[PDB]
Amino acid sequence: ACVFFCEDAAVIGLAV
């Protein structure tokens, strides 16, 4: 998987 830095606010690295 990968880590993306996204927001939907808190900007979090999401392991996806």
Which chain residues interact with a second copy by CB under 8 A?
1-7, 9-15
CB contact at 8 A, 2 and 16: yes
| Closest approach of a second copy to the CB of residue 10, in Å | 5
- Which element (helix H / strand E) includes 6? strand 3-7
CB contact at 8 A, 13 and 3: yes
